[PDB]
Structure 1
Amino acid sequence: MSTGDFLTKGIELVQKAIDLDTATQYEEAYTAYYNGLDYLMLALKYEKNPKSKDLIRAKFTEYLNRAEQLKKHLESEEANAA
C-alpha cells in the first residue's frame, strides 16, 4: 500500500515490458507496459512530495509514449501487409 510498493510492482511490470519490447513481441510488450502504467498511476496517487510525484510522472510519460509507438507500428504493420 506504499507508493514504494506500487512503484516496485510497476517497475517490475515495465521491465518485463521492455524485455518483450526488445525481443520484438510487441503485442505482449504493449500489455505489459500498460500493466506497469496502472501501478505508476497508483504510485503517484499515494505519493505526496511534489518532486517525487514529478519524477514518477516523467517516467510514466516515457513508457506511455513507448507503448503508443509500438501500437502504431503494430497496426501500421499489417496495414502495410494485409
Structure 2
Amino acid sequence: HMSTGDFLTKGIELVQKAIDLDTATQYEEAYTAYYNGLDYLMLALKYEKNPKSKDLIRAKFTEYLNRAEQLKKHLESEEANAA
C-alpha cells in the first residue's frame, strides 16, 4: 500500500489522519501525522503547476501549520509541567 510519488495524496491522507487523532485528543500522535502530512504537501506544492491548485494547497498548508503549532506548544508545555 506504499508507492513512490503521489505527494498530494500522501499528504492529504496523513492530515486526514491527524485531524481524527486531533479530534480524539491524541495530540502526540496527531502532531506526528500533521508534520508528516505537511512534508508531503510541501513537495506537492513544489511540483504543482496549476496556479489555482497551488493557491488552494498553500492556503490549507497554512491552516495545518497553524494547528500543528498549537499542538506543539501544548505538548512541550505539558512535558515541562510533568517535570
TM-score w.r.t. length of structure 2: 0.84
Give the whole-Å Cα distance in 2 for the aligned partners of 1:2 and 1:32. 18
Q: CA deviation at 1:77?
A: 2.3
- Count of residues in correspondence between the two structures: 82
Q: Over residues 6-37 of structure 1, what are the superposed CA-to-partner deviations in whole Å (9 max), with x where a residue is unaligned? A: 21111100011111111111111111001100
* Cα distance, 1:2–1:62 mapped onto 2, change above 3 Å: farther
Q: Please, what is the CA RMSD of the aligned residues?
A: 2.8
| Distance in 1 (alpha carbons) for counterparts of 2:78 and 2:63 | 22
Percent identity of the aligned residues? 100
Structure 1 residues 4 and 62: alpha-carbon distance in aligned structure 2, compared to 1, 3 A threshold:
farther
CA contact (8 A) 1:34 1:67 kept: yes
- Counterpart of 2:43 in structure 1 is 42
Superposed CA offset, 1:34-79 (max 9, x none) = 1100111111111112221111001001101100101111122243
Query: d(CA) in 2 for partners of 1:78 and 1:46?
Result: 38
Alignment gaps of 5+ in structure 1 = none
Per residue, is there more helix in 1 or in 2?
A: 1
